[PDB]
């Protein structure tokens, strides 16, 4: 629609696309099956969102209040951009960097930014895989090593779970400033993670294609096992109702919509550019549309499936704490008044509080009672990676077959993380080949950069990258891809090739969806990001053992220097889109 003179020749002609398939059997790779492509894409998407981010934000928004906005954007801004990416990869027969080069010469930044974002998110996601496999290794003992203290003061104020995470595993320091040595047992696990990645992404899609059978199927088989056990847990269907009860109060916060926005681009693996390359290996007459719709259906479904399984365990543990809490309140009274054991129950607590008060108030006042409310136990959200290493790992210890429940849960989190890495590796390896050995150079170079997360401060370093690398950059790239396919390449041209490829054209509704709303929605999330960042002073949670109210969120502000690290991680990739565009207009 805007000036694009000489777009032809730069891009394969539709007349030549029939004659470019049978000849290009050698020098470009090919999917062994249709399912080996569909499985790979599914693995990557579900593996990238449900591995940690999705389950975190669900429980960090109280359920429904996050899912509703997430699903709204999952259809309006998700489905469009998932179809757009498959279609444009199958037409231009190039990876992410080639597609934006062919469409327009100065549109290099898009492909470059997509490679930087894919590198950055994969850097700190393989640390989470290291942490996951640490727990997996430590998950082969009848007494799970986080089930009891070694009692130590920290572990007493904290839980046998909180101590295993912050002390036994992270050895966390008080600040990002205080950065100790490379935790050695963490380095072994980091090496193990980056190694098995190399083992599965050695030749690229051929070798990964045979990995994605077990890797894309296990997470599911295990996620269904965790539903049947999930719903047998006492507190499930109290927490499920809780999940189904959203709070409009959270909805009226632009943050909930921003986090829902950024999660669409995570749950759909969009603006990483690893899906474009995947479709670039299909037949030119392969129905990407059908494929995109199927993927969108399975994604939404699996997200809701996980949310249900998470809140099941949440509800169970919350009910457990309610019943343990209320038992202690019963114990205090029964002790201070020598009541016959079991005379006071949940049925007769409050009437025996006042009764015994009247009987002996001087000998009742000294009694101390906690505010044992089940509802609060559900609204008690965990920050960071705590849903897997503090909520699930504890609930598992109060479930018979705790060790099995530990190994099943951390295998399904590895598989999910590994299938996510496959698509992240494709969005950095391919853009390098377009600009085994190269794979290995990337597998070892990154592994070396992954040492910052094996420090004592290494968990606070992870928090920044997760809050920036996987945030605004994705939205911007996501906005551009939509803009540069419709207003630079022409939606009208794009409709012709759609018909040449799938054999038909998109519904008018779906055309309009990527035509106006989806671009519009991206801009809305963009504004939301700007507002929250400016409206809130940059800070972070620390774990300082031995401070006033130790088992509380101590939320110190980052040093000035961290903000430099912040203005870079969220800046450099996005700036490559304007930056290169200007550089090409002055060359």
């Amino acid at each position: 629609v805007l000036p694009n003179p000489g777009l032809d020749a730069r891009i394969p002609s539709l007349a030549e696309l029939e004659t470019i398939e049978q000849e290009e059997a050698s020098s470009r790779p090919k999917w062994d099956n249709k399912a080996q492509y569909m499985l790979t894409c599914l693995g990557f998407c579900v593996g990238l969102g449900n591995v940690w981010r999705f389950p975190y934000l669900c429980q960090s928004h109280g359920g429904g209040a996050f899912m509703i906005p997430f699903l709204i954007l999952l259809v309006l801004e998700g489905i469009p951009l998932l179809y757009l990416e498959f279609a444009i990869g199958q037409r231009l027969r190039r990876g992410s960097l080639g597609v934006w080069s062919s469409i327009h010469p100065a549109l290099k930044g898009l492909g470059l930014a997509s490679m930087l974002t894919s590198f950055m998110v994969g850097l700190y996601y393989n640390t989470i895989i290291s942490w996951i496999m640490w727990y997996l290794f430590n998950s082969f003992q009848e007494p799970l090593p986080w089930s009891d203290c070694p009692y130590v003061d920290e572990c007493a104020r904290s839980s046998p779970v909180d101590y295993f995470w912050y002390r036994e595993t992270l050895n966390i320091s008080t600040s990002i400033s205080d950065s100790g040595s490379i935790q050695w047992w963490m380095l072994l696990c980091l090496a193990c993670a980056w190694s098995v990645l190399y083992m599965c992404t050695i030749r690229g899609i051929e070798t990964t294609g045979k990995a994605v059978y077990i890797t894309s199927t296990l997470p599911y088989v295990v996620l269904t096992i965790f539903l049947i056990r999930g719903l047998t847990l006492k507190g499930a269907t109290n927490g499920i109702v809780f999940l189904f009860t959203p709070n409009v109060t959270e909805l009226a916060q632009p943050d909930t919509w921003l986090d829902a926005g950024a999660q669409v681009f995570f749950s759909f693996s969009l603006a990483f550019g690893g899906l474009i390359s995947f479709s670039s290996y299909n037949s030119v007459h392969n129905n990407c549309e059908k494929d995109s719709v199927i993927v969108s259906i399975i994604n939404g479904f699996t997200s809701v499936y996980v949310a249900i399984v998470v809140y099941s365990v949440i509800g169970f543990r919350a009910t457990q704490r309610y019943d343990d809490c209320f038992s202690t309140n019963i114990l205090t009274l029964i002790n201070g008044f020598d009541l016959p054991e079991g005379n006071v129950t949940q049925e007769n607590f409050v009437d025996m509080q006042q009764r015994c008060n009247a009987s002996d108030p001087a000998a009742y006042a000294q009694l101390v009672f906690q505010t044992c409310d089940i509802n609060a136990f559900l609204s008690e959200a965990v920050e960071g990676t705590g849903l897997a290493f503090i909520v699930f790992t504890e609930a598992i210890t109060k479930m018979p077959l705790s060790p099995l429940w530990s190994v099943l849960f951390f295998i399904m989190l590895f598989c999910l993380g590994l299938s996510s890495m496959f698509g992240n590796m494709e969005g950095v390896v391919v853009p390098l080949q377009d600009l085994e050995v190269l794979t290995g150079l990337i597998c070892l170079g990154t592994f070396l950069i992954g040492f910052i997360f094996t420090l004592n401060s290494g968990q606070y370093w992870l928090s920044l990258l997760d809050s920036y690398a996987g945030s605004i950059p994705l939205l911007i790239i996501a906005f551009c891809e939509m803009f540069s396919v419709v207003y630079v390449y022409g939606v009208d041209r794009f409709n012709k090739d759609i018909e040449f490829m799938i054999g038909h054209k998109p519904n008018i509704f779906w055309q309009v969806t990527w035509r106006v709303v989806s671009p519009l929605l991206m801009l809305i999330i963009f504004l939301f990001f700007f507002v929250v960042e400016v409206s809130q002073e940059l800070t972070y949670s620390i774990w300082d053992p031995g401070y006033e109210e130790f088992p509380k969120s101590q939320k110190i502000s980052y040093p000035n220097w961290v903000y430099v690290v912040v203005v870079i991680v969220a800046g450099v990739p996005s700036l490559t889109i304007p930056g290169y565009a200007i550089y090409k207009l002055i060359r």
Partner: peptide, 29 residues
């Protein structure tokens, strides 16, 4: 250590896999 011994086993099989895979490529001629 249980975690160490499991780690060792996993590493071994993974690196052996890698070695076999790279050698398999060498075999491909």
């Amino acid at each position: 250590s249980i975690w160490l011994i499991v780690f060792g086993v996993v590493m071994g099989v993974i690196v052996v896999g890698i070695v076999i895979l790279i050698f398999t490529g060498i075999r491909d001629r």
